[PDB]
Amino acid sequence: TLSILVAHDLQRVIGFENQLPWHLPNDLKHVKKLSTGHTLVMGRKTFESIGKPLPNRRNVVLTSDTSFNVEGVDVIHSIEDIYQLPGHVFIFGGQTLFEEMIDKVDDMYITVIEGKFRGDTFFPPYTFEDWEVASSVEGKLDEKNTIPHTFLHLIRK
Ligand SMILES: NC(=O)C1=CN([C@@H]2O[C@H](COP(=O)(O)OP(=O)(O)OC[C@H]3O[C@@H](n4cnc5c(N)ncnc54)[C@H](OP(=O)(O)O)[C@@H]3O)[C@@H](O)[C@H]2O)C=CC1
Ligand SMILES: COc1cc(Cc2cnc(N)nc2N)cc(OC)c1OC
Numbered sequence: 001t002l003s004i005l006v007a008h009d010l011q012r013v014i015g016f017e018n019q020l021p022w023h024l025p026n027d028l029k030h031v032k033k034l035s036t037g038h039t040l041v042m043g044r045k046t047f048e049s050i051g052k053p054l055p056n057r058r059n060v061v062l063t064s065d066t067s068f069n070v071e072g073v074d075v076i077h078s079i080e081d082i083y084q085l086p087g088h089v090f091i092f093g094g095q096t097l098f099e100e101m102i103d104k105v106d107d108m109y110i111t112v113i114e115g116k117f118r119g120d121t122f123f124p125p126y127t128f129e130d131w132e133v134a135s136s137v138e139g140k141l142d143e144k145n146t147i148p149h150t151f152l153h154l155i156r157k
Contacts, residue, residue, distance in 0.1 A: 003105055004101060005090040037056065052072070059073045061074075128154075
């Protein structure tokens with residue numbers, strides 16, 4: 001079972017200067033809830049941004065660097081390694097990985113950030129011609145969570 005897990009804004013921005021462009025604690029809860037007890041696959045830059053492996057799941061980082069051997073983290077050096085990994089695997093980011101995997105995965109858990117941010121990295125265009133909406137849930141707003149956002153589960157038609 002292979003999934004994409006991603007938050008993108010109205011113009012498919014995912015990233016600025018190796019950080020998330022937005023502060024949205026709710027979305028990272030959304031992320032914790034989905035991925036706890038399974039597997040993330042991420043590119044090296046995304047891991048560096050995060051700076052340590054997420055607790056209570058398997059962290060796998062895809063990189064060319066053969067001297068990568070970080071405690072708590074498993075390394076892979078090819079895309080094709082992903083399909084070996086057992087269980088529910090979430091493609092975690094960033095741009096490069098989403099590009100390489102979007103045609104490959106079963107389904108996508110998307111947070112649409114209902115806003116327009118300055119970005120330097122993007123989720124690739126996609127159509128709902130190709131993707132069925134299994135669920136669409138409004139994120140709830142409050143003092144800490146102030147950008148409107150929608151949780152999509154899409155399944156490849
Ligand atoms: N909104 C969201 O949900 C998310 C947003 N982001 C954002 O996206 C940005 C990061 O994305 P991006 O700039 O594309 O960098 P990535 O995090 O995708 O990392 C790219 C690196 O991953 C490794 N890699 C990727 N593909 C391969 C391959 N086929 N074989 C071997 N190694 C590979 C390489 O590492 P190396 O060069 O070491 O060989 C490459 O340089 C940041 O701004 C981040 O905040 C990230 C995740 C999620
Ligand atoms: C859990 O914390 C982070 C998570 C992510 C990846 C990510 C974040 N949100 C969503 N919806 N999908 C993802 N794949 C990316 C990050 O920085 C680039 C994080 O650091 C704050």
